[PDB]
């Protein structure tokens, strides 16, 4: 039977947490202020799944283009196609590697 | 039952989650530990013999049962139930399947050939690795010849080559 494609269709491992990470996450990711040109890493937080980007963007590095209210507009790539991810900071981490 | 060569080799993943398997057969081995099992009396025994697998493969439940019967009967007769401890060390967790046309086993089983080929349960086997202990004996050094004979008889019932290792406890 063909693969089904719901928005979260092969995400058991990705959305699972170890026992020591159970419960609410810390709030420091909320407090980073990103400006255009900043580099961020998409690190999905499973306790806020409805605002999380698609599983294909986990671990990708994007560039902040701007803000939309409280979300950040991030320019990234899936293979060769440019993608625009709009997401809240709880699903973002600063990329220190350049 | 098919010849045991049909299920000897490890050809796929283990099939053991009985909550997903309809009609998984019940284990037909009544006991796994024979002789004197209480830990206090086993302290008298000072020797250990092991029937060790030489190859990887699957041992059917009925072969383990046949091996258990011949060895335990021999030890009971010649050594005495108070003078040895014999343990069948592996459990037949893996469920075997067969693709045969049958009635009273589901509608898909009525389609002939390789259409809907996933088999219905046919038995159980233990998946073993090289060096794995199949049978484990604790005995007194005076009975070494008898214990080796009992394990030689057990080996003749098993689908893979084995070897007997004798060591002190």
């Amino acid at each position: 039977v063909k693969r089904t494609h719901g928005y979260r269709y092969k995400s058991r491992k990705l959305l699972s947490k170890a026992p020591r990470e159970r419960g609410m996450s810390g709030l420091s990711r909320l407090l980073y202020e990103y400006k255009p040109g900043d580099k961020v890493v998409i690190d999905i937080d499973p306790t806020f799944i409805s605002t999380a980007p698609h599983r294909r963007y986990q671990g990708k590095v994007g560039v902040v283009i701007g803000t939309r209210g409280r979300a950040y507009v991030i320019e990234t790539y899936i293979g060769d196609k440019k993608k625009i991810i709009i997401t809240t900071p709880e699903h973002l981490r600063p990329h220190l590697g350049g | 039952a098919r010849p045991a060569r049909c299920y000897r080799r490890i050809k796929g993943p283990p099939y053991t989650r009985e909550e997903y398997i309809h009609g998984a057969p019940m284990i037909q081995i009544p006991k796994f530990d024979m002789g004197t099992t209480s830990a206090a009396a086993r302290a008298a025994f000072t020797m250990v013999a092991k029937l060790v697998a030489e190859e990887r493969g699957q041992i059917r439940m009925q072969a383990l049962e046949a091996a258990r019967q011949i060895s335990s009967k021999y030890l009971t007769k010649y050594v005495g139930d108070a003078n040895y401890y014999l343990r069948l060390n592996v459990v037949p967790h893996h469920v075997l399947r067969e693709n045969r046309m049958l009635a009273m086993a589901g509608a898909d089983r009525l389609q002939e050939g390789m259409r809907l080929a996933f088999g219905s349960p046919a038995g159980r086997a233990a998946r073993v690795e090289p060096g794995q202990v199949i049978f484990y004996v604790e005995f007194k050094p005076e009975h070494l010849a008898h214990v080796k004979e009992a394990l030689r008889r057990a080996a003749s019932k098993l689908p893979i080559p084995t070897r007997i290792v004798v060591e002190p406890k």
Binding site: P19, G23, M24, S28, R29, L30, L31 | -
Partner: protein
Amino acid sequence: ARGARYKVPFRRRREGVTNYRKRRKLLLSRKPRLVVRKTNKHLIAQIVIARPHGDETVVGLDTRVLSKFGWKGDENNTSAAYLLGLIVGYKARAKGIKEAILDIGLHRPTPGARVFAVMKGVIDAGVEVPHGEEVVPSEERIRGEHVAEYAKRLKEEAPEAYKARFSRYLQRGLPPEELPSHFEEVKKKIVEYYEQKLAK
């Protein structure tokens, strides 16, 4: 505690000081917080900006600071709460803070509570704090008229109970029935001290 699968809550949660569900909603504002906390004897008012490595307190004071303006009322009543907000408000304004959001932690937002008196004092110093119009205590309570009325009734009913329940008031030389008069004196001294500072 018992076993490796036990998840120990956050340190501030198991101490019972931080409500992290409410704190998250405060941080989403991205505005400075007016933190107001109540102790048995004092009140604390802080203007705080949240940073990823830890909060930064722009201005923090408790009600001990009121002795620097010759306050002789109780340390943490409604009147003292208002004066604390005024001092914090002017100090916060001198540092560039124009707007703040009230943060009461685990205290209840009962109307007329002392937390909203600190807020009222902060508002009058020029720092805007959004609020509803039915929680600030009445000006009579801020002036301590509820304290003075209680003591006056106590004196004419049981003069000894007046002496015990306000022993520290008598020691300081300010009888409780004269609190509204003194509160205006202290409030004037605080306001004049900072408008002049702001002017210079």
